[PDB]
Design a protein around this ligand. Structure first.
Ligand code: FAD
Ligand code: FAD
Ligand code: NAP
Ligand code: NAP
Ligand code: CAC
Ligand code: CAC
Ligand code: K
Ligand code: K
Lengths: 319, 313
């Protein structure tokens, strides 16, 4: 443990997802000697999915972990300095910028924020009570515990549908709960889903919200659903409940210091360059932390590249 | 031939759009244009496509993108659009022999090499003036050649030619280059220890040659106006690219040839000034112009179009 013998670098990148690692590749080739803080989820959100089929140019068989191992190797090839830490506090009122991690503090002249997003929970007291004892937000992490069991999935987007598909090969049955009667997942995934609904072991509970997670002193034994149209409730017996209701941008540490809207970092955007510039000159943002609309790996990688070229131009304008 | 979605262009923006459109069950039809695979098919080394191991080549990446689009059953058509009508719905586009219509359109027709516009430069095209080093470089085996330009393309072309030609004369109107720093390091190693010669603070004043082709160039000093002559067998022009938008003039809002799009943080960012027409890649980006950013906006254009098509019912 050190006393603010701060590590200074010209360019600091927060995050080890596709935006952060693409930013590193471009910044290293620009001779910026980037330093990248991985955060607690090394490799980012893709490391919890098993198949990526829309990373353009890859043959059948890519996995999430596989792509992000390649991305780390690529940043390392250009001598990116990669540090396993997690930033818990920042000071952007001062130059150089100061970021406090759990291991050390860091300072920089330019900062790329690509801290991505974390799984959202419903915010129920019973959901919180059963976390780790049958409530989970990560099906690849916890699915194998439910072999031949009944499990629930809550949500109606790409993550929920993918998690229900993944669990259907492990669990005896998957109860997919969603508050409307149609899904916003990719159509190819909806086709796979509906094939398992009519021929397989997925059961739909549309127009439902999770009212309460039910359980004993050991863990989950069911969920109560509420009909969104009538207010009536029913019970479903399951041993596990996977929460797949979206991801929230990881921006809590920047509150009050960057312009933000609904937790997303605002950037210049536009067609005239400097499109990833935040409200603080010299701080740029890339990936899911500033995109509430597209939220793909390829679009995250693309804005990661833009943040590195923006930062390079900004640092060049200093000297 | 009608389709819900037509994509113009077989570069990384077009093919990423096709992958996403195909997975959205839109049955995309993609027109390749004349340069099948796009600009990247003319570079030998791609080192900043994130996640690829050492040794990726342009044609190799673009072969992979095409297979990816084919896997999801994109319909890929070798044709080139010479005329469009956007005042009608569905939109109508005319290729070399057949006509196409669509309810939604993604334009990702990229950019093509600019020439200086000199009379002698025009006169010697195909006879020693070229804008593509990997297409023509083999013809100058152990010869002296010139490259004009100061960006990533000119520096990469001078480096590529330096393994083929005896001497490469790199001509640029300032004394520093705007290429990636790692490429400038490689260039300066071959300047000090190899067969590349810098002619900084120079512009190409005239291409010289005989009845068969180029035999020299006249350079002009940008500070004094004095001139000198260089003996070369070939001149490669690498002064940037210009967006392939001529066929859209008068039907989409444009600025300097770039198609304008909504942009912004609220979605529909690739929407042009015509509802149901979207643009992605180098046709709408004059600032970043990389394969990875083109792929990203091709993804956005496919998701914008899917929402548009859904809204029709
Ligand atoms: C289950 C699942 C499946 C998916 N499948 C696909 C798919 O098939 N195709 C696709 O295109 N997209 C997919 N996505 C989306 C894709 O994962 C994201 O769009 C992409 O990962 C976003 O990249 P990013 O770099 O912005 O953020 P992330 O990948 O979220 O990475 C953010 C990084 O920031 C770091 N970080 C966070 N907070 C801090 C802090 N305080 N200090 C330092 N570092 C921090 C994290 O540790 C992480 O490394 C999927 C997502 C999920 C959850
Ligand atoms: C020599 C060179 C080296 C490069 N190296 C790199 C690199 O290492 N890394 C990197 O990231 N980027 C590199 N780039 C840039 C990269 O090539 C572009 O950013 C990217 O190709 C743009 O993709 P795109 O799909 O927008 O356009 P393009 O790849 O240009 O594709 C446009 C497509 O549209 C088609 N088209 C044109 N007109 C019509 C029409 N009327 N009808 C139908 N179709 C039409 C064309 O046939 C072509 O298929 C390089 C470029 C060059 C020239
Ligand atoms: N294969 C892939 O490309 C892939 C895989 C995973 C993720 N992604 C991308 O990553 C992003 C995140 O995906 P996601 O599915 O995690 O999020 P998402 O697209 O935001 O979906 C959230 C789903 O949960 C529902 N929901 C949200 N809050 C809720 C609440 N409090 N109670 C009940 N239901 C709630 C939403 O319902 P409504 O529909 O009623 O709002 C929606 O169906 C998306 O852009 C996605 O496309 C892509
Ligand atoms: N490795 C890669 O990532 C890679 C490889 C190739 C291309 N690209 C990208 O694709 C885009 C296109 O690059 P590019 O190099 O083709 O074009 P560019 O970036 O526009 O550079 C054009 C170069 O030519 C010079 N120039 C322009 N017009 C001129 C004229 N009339 N006479 C003399 N000189 C002239 C410019 O000089 P000034 O500098 O004096 O303006 C500049 O040096 C770029 O954004 C580039 O980074 C990337
Ligand atoms: C709206 As702003 C100050 O983040 O460019
Ligand atoms: C920039 As516009 C007129 O296409 O919204
Ligand atoms: K996935
Ligand atoms: K290249």
């Amino acid at each position: 443990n050190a006393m603010s013998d701060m590590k200074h670098s010209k360019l600091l990148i927060l995050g080890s997802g596709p935006a952060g690692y693409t930013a590193a590749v471009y910044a290293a080739r620009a001779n910026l000697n980037p330093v990248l803080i991985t955060g607690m989820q090394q490799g980012g959100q893709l490391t919890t999915t098993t198949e990526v089929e829309n990373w353009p140019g890859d043959p059948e068989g890519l996995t999430g972990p596989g792509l992000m191992d390649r991305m780390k190797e690529h940043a390392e090839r250009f001598e990116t300095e990669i540090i396993f830490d997690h930033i818990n506090e920042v000071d952007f009122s001062t130059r150089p910028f100061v970021l406090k991690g759990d291991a050390a503090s860091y300072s920089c002249d330019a900062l790329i924020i690509s801290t991505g997003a974390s799984a959202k929970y419903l915010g129920l007291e019973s959901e919180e009570a059963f976390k780790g004892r049958g409530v989970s937000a990560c099906a690849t992490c916890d699915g194998f515990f439910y072999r031949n069991q009944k499990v629930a999935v809550v949500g109606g987007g790409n993550t929920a549908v993918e998690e229900a598909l993944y669990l259907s090969n492990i669990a005896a049955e998957v109860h997919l709960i969603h508050r409307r009667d149609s899904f916003r997942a990719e159509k190819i995934l909806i086709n796979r889903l509906m094939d398992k609904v009519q021929n397989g072991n997925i059961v739909l509970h549309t127009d439902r919200v999770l009212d309460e997670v039910l359980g004993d002193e050991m863990g989950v034994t069911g969920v109560r659903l509420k009909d969104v149209k009538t207010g009536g409730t029913e019970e479903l017996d399951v041993m596990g409940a996977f929460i797949a209701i979206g991801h929230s941008p990881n921006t809590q540490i920047f509150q009050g210091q960057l312009d933000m809207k609904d937790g997303y970092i605002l950037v210049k955007s536009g067609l005239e360059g400097n499109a990833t510039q935040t409200s603080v000159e010299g701080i740029f943002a890339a990936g899911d932390v500033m995109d509430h609309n597209y939220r793909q790996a390829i679009t995250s990688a693309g804005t990661g590249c833009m943040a590195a070229l923006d930062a390079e131009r900004y640092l060049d304008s200093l000297n």
